[model samples]
Target: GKQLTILGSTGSIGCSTLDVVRHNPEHFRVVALVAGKNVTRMVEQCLEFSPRYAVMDDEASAKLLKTMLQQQGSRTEVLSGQQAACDMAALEDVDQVMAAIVGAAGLLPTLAAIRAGKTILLANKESLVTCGRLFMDAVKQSKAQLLPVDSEHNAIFQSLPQPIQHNLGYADLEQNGVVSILLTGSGGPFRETPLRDLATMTPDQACRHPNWSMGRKISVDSATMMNKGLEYIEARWLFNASASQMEVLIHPQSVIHSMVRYQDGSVLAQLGEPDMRTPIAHTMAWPNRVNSGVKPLDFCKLSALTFAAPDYDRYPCLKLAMEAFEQGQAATTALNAANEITVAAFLAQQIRFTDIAALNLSVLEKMDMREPQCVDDVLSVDANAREVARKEVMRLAS
Candidate 1:
């Protein structure tokens, strides 16, 4: 059995990972679970998994969780704060880590897992978007194994030849007869919504994804096509792909998560239900198969699968992400940070839905930071961009 640590254990991806672990308890063991400030779910998880340690990002939440666990007679030690989460990720006994924590906050701990040479089930895209060179370089220097947990990247990983799969973070797609990576997206709920009406969309309207269930932030990203853009940047780093070697297509069905093109004109794609558990389980049991509790796809019941190119007029944020990737890591870092702030503001009704792309563009255009040299440099760029986004948010709101 492999010992495991799940960062962001209370979120959507983390919960699904736990569900997969539940179905295959004999193959996996829980050593630690880390989360933000959700004490009730944290208590439930700690009691059920019986992990040796449980960490919360907030001190007050940690104390409450400790008392709740103690009353139930669970022996799990409770720790709090950011450094504690990083420590749990790097623990010697943990063989693998589910790096699922959201936002830039996830970068350091996921890096800690990489530096420790643990097999990393990477669910955090910001880590790669903000620090691609540093992250992949660390994977090489530490000989750490990376398994993509996002459905698209996981699909790309599965569809590639075994040689590239075995040497991820350092594979040459061209030499292996691979032509290009076809990245697909669902085009989100508003795929057909009138472009002139986008400004009136509410957060709930944006979050109502047509194909998959995900966290609010990502669901909103999907509606804007920025999620696909971030995934595009992620594919660049993960597959060592140049911009010409990657193409994003709108596949609203999401059945074909992603595909790989070979030099001989063969296209290999990994298809399945839009459940996260399938990808979660895929990474959890790589080079092997496991039951993820996701039902097999029933093609007869599916809608007519469709494909189209994205309309930049409707999804400007997606275009921004692609442009940011070409500019440099600092640009992507600023774009991601600014997106986070603008998304939150839009969700709060402080800014209109359409303002998201506008504010993100403003922040990206204002940033001239150099390429990040270290994780700290990434954080500095992230913070500075966030401040700029906040100022713009106030300007828009007023």
Candidate 2:
């Protein structure tokens, strides 16, 4: 059994990763479980897994979980704070780290896992979107193995050539006879909504993802197609792909997570149910197969799969993300931070739905920070962008 440390163990991806582990108990052992302040769910997870260590983002949550575990006569050690999470990620006995924490908070721990040269099951977007060069360079220097846990990137990985798979972030697609990487998205729930009504769309309306159930922030990201945009930036770093070497296709069904096209005119895609378990299982048991407990797709009962290109007018955030990637890491980091604030404001009904892209663009335009040289620089850019975005949000409110 592989010893595993799961970051973000209480979130949707974290829970799904555990579900895959739950069935394949013979293949995995939970060494550590990390979470943000979700004591109830964390307690349940700690009891079931009996991991050696459990980490909470805050001390109070850790104290609560510690008391509960002690009452239950569990031996799991409870720790708190970001440094503890980072230590867990780099634990000597851990064979793999599931980097599933959301947003900027995930970046450091994920980087710690990379620095330790652990096989990283990358489920978070920020690590690569904000620190692509640093992370990829670290992967090369440490000889770490990176397996994509996101459904789209995992699908693309599954379809890629073995050589390219083994040498991610440094492999040359053209040299491998790979023509283009086709990144696919379901285009969310607003694919056909009247463009004129976009500003009037509420957060409840935006949170409805047609194919996959996800966290509210991500669901809204899907609606705006910014989720795919972030994934686009991630794909760029993961595959060492240039802007021209990638293309985004709107796949309404999401049955085909992503595809890789070859120079020989063959297009390969990994198709499965819109369940995170499939990809989670794939990353967990790389070079081997495991049952993820997700039922095999019933093709005969499925609806007709469809594909189209996204409209810039409908998904301006997507455009901004693409542009940000070309600008620099600083720009991409700022863009992600601004989008996080703008999306939150929209969800809070403090800003109109359309203002997400507007404020995001404004923040990007105003900030001209140089490429971040380290994690601190990235954090600085993220904070600066968030502050600017909040002011813009407030200005709009006034």
Candidate 3:
């Protein structure tokens, strides 16, 4: 059985991972579980899995989990704070680490697991969004296996040539006639909403994703098409492509996750019903397919499939993300951090949806885009961007 450490046991990805483990009990064991602040759900997970260790982002929540577990005659060790979470990620017995924690908070622990040379199942887009070069460099130095759990990237991964090569310039790919990547976007709940009415849109309306069920922040990103933008940044590092080599296509059906074009004029696409478990199980079992409890795709029942070009003017975050990818290094980090803060503000009704990209652009413009020296430097950049974003939010509110 593969020993597993889940860095966000209470989020959407974490819950899906646990469901996989629950289904395939004979093949996987939960060694450690980490959660942010959902103590009730964390306690429930602890009871079900009885992991060797648990870490909570909050110390009080960790203590509460510890007391709750102790009362139930469980001896699982509990730790608190970000450092403890990082330590748990690098635990000796863990063979695979699920980097599922959301936003910039996931970067440290995910990097810790990478440094420890564990097979990393990366679900957190911000890790790559904020520090793609740093994280990829760490993977190389540590000889760790990195598998993408995002449906879009995993699709591209499956379609790409094996023994993937990186650092080849975009000119090389294009000169060799390797065409652009086609990233599919679901376009969220506002796909048909009049652009003029978007100013008064509520958080609930923004969070109402048309297809996949996701966390509030991610749902908001989907609504704003920021998620697709982050995926664009992620693909730049994952496939060594440039902004010019990537294109976003709006596919409301979401059956065709993503596609890649090769030098031979052949394009390969990964198609499946909209399901996270498909990619999760694919990454977890790699070289061996497992039952992921997802229903098989029935193309006959689904009569038509449609695709359209994304509206960059309406979804400015998508354009901002592409610009950030073009800018390189800490610019993407600043974009990710600023977007996180801006989205949070929008969800709290402190800002408008259109202001999300504006805030991100403001932060990116004000911040210096020096190459991050280390993980600490990445965190510092993230902190600085958040501060700038918060200030923008305040200014916009006033």
Candidate 4:
């Protein structure tokens, strides 16, 4: 059985990953579970999984968890603080890491997993979006095996040439007979809503996704098409994609997750029920197959799978992401940081739904275009951007 560590054991991806693991007990041994401040759920996980180590990002939370586990007579060692999670990810006995921590906070730990040369199940998009070159350089230097855990990128990975599927950081898509990557998105709850009314949309309305269940931040991104944009930055670095070859399309059905077109007129696509577990299982069992535990798509009862071009007027965030990707990694770093802050403000009802893109635009424009050369450079840019964005959120609230 393969030994592994889950970098986020309480979030959606982390929970689903455990579900996947549960269905295949003979295939894995969970060595560690790292979560944020969710001690209750992590306690339950620790009791059930019996992992050797359980980690949290807050020291106070860690101490509480340690007491609970001790009272329960569990031998799991509890550690806390941000560095603890990163250290756990690089443990020598761990063969694979599920890097599912959810924000700028996730970047360092994911990189730690990479530098250790572990098989990285990369669910964190911001790592690639903010530090494309820096992150890929670490992968190359460490000879780490990176697997895309996001559904769209994993779909593109499935559609690409076999050799590049496992190691996209150094592969040439064009040299491998790929002509283009057709990225698809379900353009969210407001896809057909009146453009003039967008400013009045409530957070609940924005998060009421038509097809997928995701965290509030990403759900809000989907509503504005910014999620697709972040994925675009990730795809560019993951596949070395040509700007001309990557086309974003609005696939309302989301059945055809994504596609890769070849120079020979062959377009390959990977389709399934719109479930994260499908992609999770795909990466978990790379060069093989596994039961993802998702219901298979019944084409007989399905609606027509449709495709249309995304409307830049309604999805200005998507446009901004592409523009930032072209400008420099620094701008991408700022954009991601700004989006994370802006989305939280929106969720808290401190900002309007439309202000997400506006705030991100202001924050991106204010950012210094200093192309990142290392992890410190990436961290520096993100911190500065968040500080600026918080001030803007205050101004907007007033």
Q: Which candidate number would show the highest TM-score if scored against the true structure?
A: 2
Q: What is the overall TM-score of model 3 with all chains considered together?
A: 0.91
Task: List the candidate 4 regions with Cα displacement exceeding 4 Å.
Answer: none
User: Candidate 4 on 346-394: residue-level lDDT in tens?
Assistant: 9999999999999999998888667988878788998999999999999
lDDT (Cα, tens digit) per residue for candidate 2, span 1-398: 99999999999889998898899999999999999999999999999988999999999999999999999889899999999999999999999999999877898999999999999999986789899999999999988989999889999999999998887888899999999999999888889999999989998889988976778888989999998999999999999999989999999988889999999999999999978899999989988899999998999989899999899999999999999999999999999899889999999999988999888999999999999999999999999999999999999999
Output the TM-score of candidate 2: 0.97
Q: Quick one: RMSD of model 2?
A: 1.2
TM-score of predicted structure 4: 0.96
lDDT of 3 by residue, 1-398 (tens): 89999989898789889999888989889999999888889888988998989889988898888888889888889889999999989989999999999876888889999899998988986788778888888887887778889999888777766555232111145654568888898888888889997787899889888876777898999988989999988988866787678889999888899998887889999999877888998888875788888899988877477988898878888888888877876888888888889999999999988788778889988997687877788878888988999999999999
lDDT string for model 1 (130-189, tens) is: 889999999989988899999899999999999888778798999999999999998989
Clashing pairs in 3: none
Candidate 1 wrong stretches, greater than 4 Å:
none
Q: How many Å off is the CA of 109 in candidate 2? A: 1.4
Where is model 3 more than 4 Å wrong at Cα?
A: 165-178
Sliding window of 10 residues with minimal summed lDDT for model 4: 163-172
- RMSD of candidate 3 to the truth, in angstroms, is 2.9
Local accuracy by lDDT, each model: 0.93, 0.92, 0.85, 0.90
- Model 4 / residue 294 / CA error / Å: 1.2
